[PDB]
Scaffold this active site. Sequence first.
Site, PDB file in Angstrom:
ATOM      1  N   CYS A  46       0.863  -1.198   0.000  1.00 19.98           N
ATOM      2  CA  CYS A  46       0.000   0.000   0.000  1.00 19.98           C
ATOM      3  C   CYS A  46       0.891   1.238   0.000  1.00 19.98           C
ATOM      4  CB  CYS A  46      -0.928   0.019   1.222  1.00 19.98           C
ATOM      5  SG  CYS A  46      -1.915   1.510   1.462  1.00 19.98           S
ATOM      6  N   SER A  48       0.650   3.751   1.714  1.00 19.38           N
ATOM      7  CA  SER A  48       0.930   4.160   3.110  1.00 19.38           C
ATOM      8  C   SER A  48       2.215   3.519   3.666  1.00 19.38           C
ATOM      9  CB  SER A  48      -0.234   3.859   4.061  1.00 19.38           C
ATOM     10  OG  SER A  48      -1.390   4.554   3.639  1.00 19.38           O
ATOM     11  N   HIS A  51       4.909   5.591   2.397  1.00 15.06           N
ATOM     12  CA  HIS A  51       4.994   6.839   3.158  1.00 15.06           C
ATOM     13  C   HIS A  51       5.917   6.691   4.384  1.00 15.06           C
ATOM     14  CE1 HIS A  51       2.048   8.611   0.667  1.00 15.06           C
ATOM     15  NE2 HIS A  51       0.972   8.394   1.405  1.00 15.06           N
ATOM     16  N   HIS A  67       0.697  -3.566   6.500  1.00 10.04           N
ATOM     17  CA  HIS A  67      -0.621  -3.487   7.145  1.00 10.04           C
ATOM     18  C   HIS A  67      -1.767  -4.050   6.367  1.00 10.04           C
ATOM     19  CE1 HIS A  67      -0.498   0.133   4.661  1.00 10.04           C
ATOM     20  NE2 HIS A  67      -1.835   0.141   4.692  1.00 10.04           N
ATOM     21  N   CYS A 174      -6.879  -3.366   3.565  1.00  8.27           N
ATOM     22  CA  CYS A 174      -6.697  -1.923   3.459  1.00  8.27           C
ATOM     23  C   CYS A 174      -7.292  -1.370   2.188  1.00  8.27           C
ATOM     24  CB  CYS A 174      -5.244  -1.481   3.601  1.00  8.27           C
ATOM     25  SG  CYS A 174      -5.220   0.329   3.518  1.00  8.27           S
TER      26      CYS A 174
HETATM   27  N1  LIG Z   1      -7.655   6.727   4.496  1.00  7.21           N
HETATM   28  C1  LIG Z   1      -7.224   5.467   4.504  1.00  7.21           C
HETATM   29  O1  LIG Z   1      -7.591   4.617   5.367  1.00  7.21           O
HETATM   30  C2  LIG Z   1      -6.190   5.086   3.564  1.00  7.21           C
HETATM   31  C3  LIG Z   1      -6.056   3.720   3.149  1.00  7.21           C
HETATM   32  C4  LIG Z   1      -5.229   3.327   2.107  1.00  7.21           C
HETATM   33  C5  LIG Z   1      -4.490   4.282   1.506  1.00  7.21           C
HETATM   34  N2  LIG Z   1      -4.500   5.651   1.938  1.00  7.21           N
HETATM   35  C6  LIG Z   1      -3.798   6.665   1.234  1.00  7.21           C
HETATM   36  O2  LIG Z   1      -4.434   6.836  -0.050  1.00  7.21           O
HETATM   37  C7  LIG Z   1      -3.462   7.336  -1.007  1.00  7.21           C
HETATM   38  C8  LIG Z   1      -3.511   6.468  -2.243  1.00  7.21           C
HETATM   39  O3  LIG Z   1      -3.016   5.141  -1.945  1.00  7.21           O
HETATM   40  P1  LIG Z   1      -2.733   4.132  -3.136  1.00  7.21           P
HETATM   41  O4  LIG Z   1      -3.919   4.048  -4.023  1.00  7.21           O
HETATM   42  O5  LIG Z   1      -2.143   2.898  -2.518  1.00  7.21           O
HETATM   43  O6  LIG Z   1      -1.546   4.954  -3.856  1.00  7.21           O
HETATM   44  P2  LIG Z   1      -1.005   4.986  -5.338  1.00  7.21           P
HETATM   45  O7  LIG Z   1      -1.130   3.630  -5.962  1.00  7.21           O
HETATM   46  O8  LIG Z   1       0.338   5.658  -5.287  1.00  7.21           O
HETATM   47  O9  LIG Z   1      -2.016   5.911  -6.149  1.00  7.21           O
HETATM   48  C9  LIG Z   1      -1.932   7.341  -6.113  1.00  7.21           C
HETATM   49  C10 LIG Z   1      -2.261   7.842  -7.509  1.00  7.21           C
HETATM   50  O10 LIG Z   1      -2.224   9.287  -7.452  1.00  7.21           O
HETATM   51  C11 LIG Z   1      -1.697   9.775  -8.673  1.00  7.21           C
HETATM   52  N3  LIG Z   1      -1.239  11.158  -8.504  1.00  7.21           N
HETATM   53  C12 LIG Z   1      -0.102  11.548  -7.934  1.00  7.21           C
HETATM   54  N4  LIG Z   1      -0.032  12.890  -7.932  1.00  7.21           N
HETATM   55  C13 LIG Z   1      -1.198  13.324  -8.554  1.00  7.21           C
HETATM   56  C14 LIG Z   1      -1.771  14.614  -8.914  1.00  7.21           C
HETATM   57  N5  LIG Z   1      -1.108  15.725  -8.588  1.00  7.21           N
HETATM   58  N6  LIG Z   1      -2.925  14.632  -9.479  1.00  7.21           N
HETATM   59  C15 LIG Z   1      -3.658  13.532  -9.775  1.00  7.21           C
HETATM   60  N7  LIG Z   1      -3.133  12.293  -9.533  1.00  7.21           N
HETATM   61  C16 LIG Z   1      -1.936  12.231  -8.899  1.00  7.21           C
HETATM   62  C17 LIG Z   1      -0.603   8.778  -9.055  1.00  7.21           C
HETATM   63  O11 LIG Z   1      -0.246   8.831 -10.434  1.00  7.21           O
HETATM   64  C18 LIG Z   1      -1.223   7.445  -8.589  1.00  7.21           C
HETATM   65  O12 LIG Z   1      -1.851   6.731  -9.650  1.00  7.21           O
HETATM   66  C19 LIG Z   1      -2.117   7.356  -0.247  1.00  7.21           C
HETATM   67  O13 LIG Z   1      -1.851   8.668   0.264  1.00  7.21           O
HETATM   68  C20 LIG Z   1      -2.347   6.374   0.883  1.00  7.21           C
HETATM   69  O14 LIG Z   1      -1.429   6.636   1.940  1.00  7.21           O
HETATM   70  C21 LIG Z   1      -5.374   5.989   2.963  1.00  7.21           C
HETATM   71  O1  LIG Z   2      -3.200   2.890   4.264  1.00  5.08           O
HETATM   72  C1  LIG Z   2      -3.795   3.002   5.553  1.00  5.08           C
HETATM   73  C2  LIG Z   2      -3.132   4.042   6.432  1.00  5.08           C
HETATM   74  C3  LIG Z   2      -3.679   5.292   6.765  1.00  5.08           C
HETATM   75  F1  LIG Z   2      -4.847   5.643   6.199  1.00  5.08           F
HETATM   76  C4  LIG Z   2      -3.043   6.192   7.577  1.00  5.08           C
HETATM   77  F2  LIG Z   2      -3.623   7.357   7.841  1.00  5.08           F
HETATM   78  C5  LIG Z   2      -1.852   5.837   8.155  1.00  5.08           C
HETATM   79  F3  LIG Z   2      -1.266   6.718   8.995  1.00  5.08           F
HETATM   80  C6  LIG Z   2      -1.262   4.629   7.875  1.00  5.08           C
HETATM   81  F4  LIG Z   2      -0.096   4.317   8.429  1.00  5.08           F
HETATM   82  C7  LIG Z   2      -1.911   3.754   7.049  1.00  5.08           C
HETATM   83  F5  LIG Z   2      -1.323   2.583   6.794  1.00  5.08           F
HETATM   84 ZN   LIG Z   3      -3.081   1.143   3.445  1.00  4.33          ZN
END
Ligand SMILES: NC(=O)c1ccc[n+]([C@@H]2O[C@H](COP(=O)([O-])OP(=O)([O-])OC[C@H]3O[C@@H](n4cnc5c(N)[nH+]cnc54)[C@H](O)[C@@H]3O)[C@@H](O)[C@H]2O)c1
Ligand SMILES: OCc1c(F)c(F)c(F)c(F)c1F
Ligand SMILES: [Zn+2]
EC number: 1.1.1.1
Lengths: 374, 374
Positions: A46, A48, A51, A67, A174
Amino acid sequence: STAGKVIKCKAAVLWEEKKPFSIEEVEVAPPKAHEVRIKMVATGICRSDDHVVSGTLVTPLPVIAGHEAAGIVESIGEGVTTVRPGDKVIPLFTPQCGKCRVCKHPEGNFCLKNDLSMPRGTMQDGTSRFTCRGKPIHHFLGTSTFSQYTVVDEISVAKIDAASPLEKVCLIACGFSTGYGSAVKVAKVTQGSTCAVFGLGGVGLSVIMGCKAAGAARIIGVDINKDKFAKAKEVGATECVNPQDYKKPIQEVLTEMSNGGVDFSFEVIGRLDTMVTALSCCQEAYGVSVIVGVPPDSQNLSMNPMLLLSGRTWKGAIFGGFKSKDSVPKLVADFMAKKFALDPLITHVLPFEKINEGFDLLRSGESIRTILTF
Amino acid sequence: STAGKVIKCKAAVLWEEKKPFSIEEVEVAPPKAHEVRIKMVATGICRSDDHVVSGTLVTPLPVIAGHEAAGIVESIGEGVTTVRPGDKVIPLFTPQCGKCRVCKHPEGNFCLKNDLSMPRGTMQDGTSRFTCRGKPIHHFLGTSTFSQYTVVDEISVAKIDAASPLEKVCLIACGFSTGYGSAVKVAKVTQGSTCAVFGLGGVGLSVIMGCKAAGAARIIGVDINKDKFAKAKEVGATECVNPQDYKKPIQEVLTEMSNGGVDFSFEVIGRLDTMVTALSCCQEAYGVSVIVGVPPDSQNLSMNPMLLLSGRTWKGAIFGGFKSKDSVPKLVADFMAKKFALDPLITHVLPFEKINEGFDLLRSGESIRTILTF
Ligand SMILES: NC(=O)c1ccc[n+]([C@@H]2O[C@H](COP(=O)([O-])OP(=O)([O-])OC[C@H]3O[C@@H](n4cnc5c(N)[nH+]cnc54)[C@H](O)[C@@H]3O)[C@@H](O)[C@H]2O)c1
Ligand SMILES: OCc1c(F)c(F)c(F)c(F)c1F
Ligand SMILES: [Zn+2]
Ligand SMILES: NC(=O)c1ccc[n+]([C@@H]2O[C@H](COP(=O)([O-])OP(=O)([O-])OC[C@H]3O[C@@H](n4cnc5c(N)[nH+]cnc54)[C@H](O)[C@@H]3O)[C@@H](O)[C@H]2O)c1
Ligand SMILES: OCc1c(F)c(F)c(F)c(F)c1F
Ligand SMILES: [Zn+2]
Ligand SMILES: [Zn+2]
Ligand SMILES: [Zn+2]
């Protein structure tokens, strides 16, 4: 037998930020009371997790991250009632203690026992079950799935269908559940509506899935990487737009496309600017925008509150709003019953030993989800 | 006798920011098609009118302000169907055209014909019905109630009960409905919940009334003027706090008082800092915060989007989320049936000629609502 004994196993340790994972032997203590030790089967990569590597998310190091996973219970501590040795399980990165004010609330899921807000990188008791080269190693979100074996608190594990394919349902831990729930539960996307989804990775694709399941008429995918568009259309996007193709800001483009703003928008990237853009592109009087992306540590955004005074709703959520222990088993049952698909999210399957290669595929733009198999 | 003719009458003209109103003769043109000319009976002084004077709210000057009023139709233009001469009416500062996408939406009220987002200070046709000293004078929000006579578009007026007491029900034109609706409609306050209300003026008192009506168990009033607390308690506050009494920031105080954050918070002041404080003090997983106060022109707030990611909902609204033309007559009927009280908001009564004294009373902290009689 391994029950009651220290297990020496392989894990991916992150010793410092911005370096590769080190694949080496760790010692995994047996579970204490109300703890569960799990032999991992499959884990996703993921954003995250990346990150933690990049320093976008701060958590104590050294750490066993990971995770988004599934495995099989190896042993249980005294007092565990909800899983047994041999059960398929998903570690829950958001716990469900069942006792706190949030767990008791009908709409709350961010249990107060979580290790996200103020991360300690430990078990609930404030200690670690991991050592490597004689040094204690931190947990991550109470899960630590980048290891052949982990130990989790009971409140951070759910029993799932014994016939579940773990190399697929690990995504319910996730990225699928987060995106899907963000649409169906948190936004409560309506039939006939117009949605905009910013970011077309595994989570954003899952948001599209949810918007389509909720009956949206239009689902506009937004990504700077046009290679993401084909799969977004396959899972339900009606249109895709790349902000880099336009002379105007994309909120203006989206407002024009939707004849005055979208019904529902989702930020699924993790950037301050796209959080504001996504809010702005929803209709000013009745639009809803949901923040899903994780932003860089300790950074504030700037916005004009007139965006909200006109009537917009701005919300965010962890894990799609799902109460984790109640929801995960039902999500896996629904998958087993063909209610949704996970294969569209899975672009690469690698041995666990290739974790670094899996992260490089994410960072390069080439993958959605890589599943690591133990 | 005056139908079709220009009316000369007194109005309160604001020629310049940060100056007293000038009570002087103006010429009020007769209504054009789908316009209504109204003899004003009573108008309240809302802090948003003061914002025009202070430059907190930017609208073209010179202007006839006033937006919280009631009166009696003097004449109707061609094609008007919804009011007649002699009807009691409330000008609607938020129109309801009934035809735009917002008017058609079940939850929208910020009709696209409003003159709030990008004020022109005109009628719907882009012109003015007011002349003073031979110069055209701007309208305000399509209402301009600080005049013995005004002209409004039909979509900006509601017919109300012929037996209505206008010197009371004028408050339904802004402050009561805004606050009450913000609680009952926008936030959807629940029985047994804990609410925090920032700002205990006429609007914040009306928020309290709504939270009490919705069954809240605890309603914590927050104001830097402790003289506001007695009235707040009379209308339902269970306790009041002055941020100036505390060493710690009031979001921390309120989180402590509420054993981990409030269910519902309301910003009813108009400051960027209290908008962020009010968001922060609601519980991080399931709390809701509603912006009611009007921010200073063109200024952005700064906030950490983690406050939303955990699960908070942040929203704002104009006029309590009420579809204005549908709702104002019902609110008047409910008032007539004693479903809510307006007298607690009325602290002072003055003739219209004493408008400046009425603004002095608001600015000193002494009044809640002054009602001006024509
Ligand atoms: N809230 C939650 O519980 C939760 C859960 C899982 C993931 N996340 C977050 O969700 C985000 C996405 O996760 P993911 O899908 O695994 O990531 P990912 O696979 O990197 O997807 C992100 C997408 O965003 C695109 N992107 C980057 N910059 C831009 C821009 N400026 N404009 C438009 N598109 C852009 C990029 O090309 C990519 O396809 C991350 O920040 C994770 O940390 C949060
Ligand atoms: O991808 C799920 C996810 C989150 F949404 C967070 F906000 C975070 F801090 C983290 F560690 C995480 F794994
Ligand atoms: Zn996640
Ligand atoms: N959204 C809408 O439709 C709508 C309608 C009506 C009024 N408004 C706005 O709502 C706000 C309140 O209007 P009102 O009730 O007529 O005004 P008011 O009578 O000036 O009440 C505001 C209260 O805020 C208090 N206050 C000022 N600074 C602080 C502080 N730092 N902390 C705590 N309390 C403080 C102040 O003492 C006063 O009692 C103004 O900004 C109006 O412009 C918005
Ligand atoms: O008090 C009601 C009110 C508002 F809520 C505004 F946002 C505004 F711009 C205005 F002029 C006004 F009068
Ligand atoms: Zn809990
Ligand atoms: Zn309309
Ligand atoms: Zn007002």
